[PDB]
Amino acid sequence: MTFSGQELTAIIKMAKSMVMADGKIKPAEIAVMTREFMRFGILQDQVDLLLKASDSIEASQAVALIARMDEERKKYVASYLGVIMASDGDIDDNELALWTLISTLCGLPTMTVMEAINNMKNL
């Protein structure tokens, strides 16, 4: 599972869009977003670079870039978005809803939070 700089900028764009939706400051959730993204196999500083790059692209362009991925790559993008909002393995109703919406628009497969966690472990 390789990804271009453009594709990684899209993926982090989706994570950013999702976590900003509720307007709240949530330190642990941002830290999951940043730590787990490294499982794609960049370093922390590269995650920070890519996140700042994402400010310069349209979220709608990110949608398009993601939606054209093969199913294997989409499975792990969905798994990554799923683990972000997990707390002790649980997500609440409003979090599942957001994960569900961005998944639908991106054409991503449906999964449980347990599957998303198990997916990010094998990566």
| Binding site, annotated residues | 19, 22, 24
CA 118, CA 52: separation in Å to the nearest integer?
Answer: 28
Give the bridge partners for 90, in sequence order: 87
Q: Which of the ranges 3-11, 16-24, 78-86 carries the binding residues for a second copy, by CB under 8 A?
A: 16-24
Q: Which of the ranges 2-10, 31-39, 76-84 carries the binding residues for a second copy, by CB under 8 A?
A: 31-39
Residue 24 binding Mg ion, by CB under 5 A: yes
Residue 28 binding a second copy, by CB under 8 A: yes
CA 65, CA 83: separation in Å to the nearest integer?
Answer: 21
Q: CB of 50: closest distance to a second copy in angstroms? A: 11
Closer residue to a second copy in complex, CB, 22/41: 22
Q: Contact 15/81 with Cβ under 8 angstroms? A: yes
Q: Contact 84/37 with Cβ under 8 angstroms? A: no
The residue ranges that bind Mg ion (CB under 5 A) are 19, 22, 24
